[PDB]
DNA sequence: CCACCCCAACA
DNA sequence: CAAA
DNA sequence: CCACCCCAACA
DNA sequence: CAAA
DNA sequence: CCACCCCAACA
DNA sequence: CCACCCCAACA
């Protein structure tokens, strides 16, 4: 029975190079990880209200009342790139490469180990002894038939660690539960009242109670025993490790210079506007850079912090990615943001229960948008715009002051084009389902790759119950034996990749390492300390061109 | 546009004991889906811990 | 004996 | 159109 | 003797 | 992806 | 030994 | 079941 090992550990990354330039890449990793006794063995359906937050007039951006329910399951999540890669890889991956895809992914999981704890030590001081039971249970619950929801942790940054030497935890799996909201509007400090912050009973009709003993099988594991998932194939759309700046202004032929400088300080100069020949899509007799027609709308102008509502009501409406144009509209261009802790980033060696992220800011440039530059004109599009006959970014809208129309503005025309969220090093996402809708998103701004079909089939883990001399069900509180244990998790995950190529003269931008300095990109950062801490920052990948018209 | 039955379209002159019968068209559609759903925006994903 | 505004989803 |  | 920013729609 |  | 909320990507 | 800082002294 117990004796001999049931798996091997690789957290290596293989690297095959085929014939013209398709490489595939093959990352493993083997994180050994703890789980604990659930608390309960019971299914939960708990709810939260928070009225200290709700209660105010302006907290509204605050609400965090759902209508959840607790499985005494355990989940395992590595749907993660720092799980797949390290500083280097990612390196030499967005680095060289052109674009990427994704393949397989097989799981696997050995070299279970459970134990039990006595907690002795009266006729001393404490002790808490530690032993074996042999004889122990782990269910281990795969759900591909995705029955049940998806929960991608990678969400609430609960995953798998990443630094493979060092012992990780699972994710309890919960999921969302039928409700429903009212919640009104208010500012600051407003008078009158709310009205009405109520929560919602049983929507005998929303109802979905889902039960893992139920729906999906589980495999007993003891001791010598192994589990393992088949090679699930992807079937994605590639992910393009290059970044565009052809802006509506860098699309086509630029104007013909009939004067050129005559040495370094001297710029040239075009021909008589309303002279000029071209063509444009406004009723005036001179073209311009602005004026004038182009293949299609760079980058769409998204509403920024809206607010829409429904039956849970709030909530953000999102943005797909876009610069932060030289105003840093940072909010606008829905430049992201992340919030992790140690097992996942952090000063591995800092302190305070305070968080940690690193706004991300697309390179998708000449797409974003300023809103520091807005501008609509009227009929007869007299350029010397007279302000009657303008709407700028500080014209009032509503009555309020601060509040502008850019705030409100929508501008998703059947001629708008835009590059696809990239993915984030660390932290970021990978995979993601997609929402069983007849019709559905463009993308998910929540992860660079949305299977086409079905989707990898949930991994979740748990302690099978040990129990004692004593059990009559019949019993308010039953008592159990203090149970926890250890299982190694292993991973393939598959990608097949091109080479770019060189096309300019220029060269061009890239991820290095610099000394030591204080600036971003500076080893240190990453190496580890005295000690041994580590820190994992996330990086860029997407540095370089790709002349989008 | 003007158009004109007794001009682009056959007319089959039934009298008593005339059956009138077209052919099986076949559909080329998408199904249609006989559930509701109901999951929001704050109820699509990993609720808090 | 119904196929993409005609003969003609031709035969 | 990134595999085949 | 023009195919998806190279060789190379390869042969 | 609802047929095949 | 993971395919589209079951058996069952059936065999 | 150890070969030239990866897959792979490949099979």
Redesign the interface.
């Given at each position: 029975g117990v004796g001999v090992s049931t798996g091997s550990y690789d957290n290596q990354t293989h690297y095959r190079f085929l014939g013209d330039g398709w490489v595939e890449i093959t990352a493993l990793a083997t994180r050994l990880v703890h789980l604990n006794m659930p608390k309960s063995e019971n299914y939960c359906r708990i709810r939260?209200h928070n009225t200290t937050d709700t209660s105010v007039k302006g907290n509204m951006a605050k609400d965090?009342a759902?209508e959840?329910i607790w499985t005494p399951w355990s989940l395992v999540d590595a749907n993660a790139w720092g799980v797949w890669l390290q500083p280097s890889d990612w390196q030499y991956i967005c680095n060289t490469m052109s674009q990427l895809n994704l393949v397989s992914l097989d799981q696997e999981i050995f070299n279970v180990v459970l134990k039990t704890v006595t907690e002795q030590d009266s006729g001393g001081q404490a002790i808490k002894i530690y032993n074996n039971d042999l004889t122990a249970c782990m269910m281990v619950a795969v759900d591909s038939n995705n029955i049940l929801p998806?929960?991608?942790?990678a969400?609430?940054m609960?995953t798998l660690g990443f630094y493979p030497w060092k012992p990780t935890i699972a994710?309890?799996y919960?999921?969302?539960f039928?409700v429903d909201r009212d919640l009104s509007v208010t500012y600051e400090n407003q008078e009158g009242t709310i009205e009405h912050n109520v929560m919602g009973t049983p929507?005998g009709?929303?109802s979905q109670f889902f039960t893992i003993e139920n729906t999906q099988q589980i495999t007993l594991l003891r001791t010598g025993d192994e589990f393992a998932t088949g090679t699930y194939y992807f079937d994605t759309n590639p992910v393009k490790l290059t970044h565009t700046w052809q802006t509506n202004r860098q699309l086509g032929q630029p104007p013909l210079l009939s004067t050129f400088p005559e040495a370094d300080t001297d710029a040239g100069t075009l021909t008589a506007q309303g002279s000029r020949h071209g063509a444009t899509q406004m009723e005036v007799n001179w073209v311009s850079e602005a004026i004038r027609t182009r293949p299609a709308q760079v980058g769409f102008c998204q509403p920024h912090n809206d607010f829409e509502a429904?039956?849970?009501?709030?909530?953000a409406a999102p943005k797909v990615p876009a610069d932060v144009t030289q105003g840093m509209d940072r909010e606008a261009n829905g430049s992201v943001r992340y919030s992790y802790g140690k097992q996942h980033g952090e000063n591995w060696a800092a302190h305070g229960p305070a968080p940690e992220r690193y706004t991300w800011d697309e390179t998708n440039f000449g797409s974003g948008r300023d809103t520091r530059d807005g501008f609509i004109q009227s009929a007869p599009l007299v350029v010397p715009p007279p302000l009657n006959g303008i709407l700028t970014n500080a014209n009032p809208i509503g009555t309020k002051n601060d509040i502008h129309f850019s705030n409100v503005f929508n501008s998703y025309g059947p001629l708008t084009t835009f590059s696809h969220p990239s993915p984030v090093y660390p932290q970021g996402q990978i995979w993601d389902k997609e929402?069983?809708?007849?019709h559905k998103p463009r993308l998910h701004i929540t992860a660079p790759f949305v299977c086409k079909n079905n989707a990898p089939g949930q991994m979740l883990v748990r302690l099978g119950p040990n129990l004692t001399d004593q059990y009559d069900p019949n019993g308010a509180t039953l008592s159990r034996i203090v149970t926890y244990g250890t299982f190694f998790w292993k991973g393939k995950l598959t990608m097949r990749a091109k080479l770019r190529a060189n096309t300019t003269w220029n060269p061009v931008y890239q991820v290095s390492v610099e000394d030591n300095g204080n600036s971003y990109m500076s080893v240190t950062k990453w190496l580890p300390t005295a000690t041994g801490n580590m820190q994992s920052v996330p990086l860029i990948t997407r540095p370089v061109a790709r002349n989008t018209y």
């Open positions: 939260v965090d759902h959840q998806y929960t991608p942790a969400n609430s609960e994710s309890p919960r999921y969302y039928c929507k009709m929303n429904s039956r849970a009501g709030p909530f929402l069983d809708l007849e």
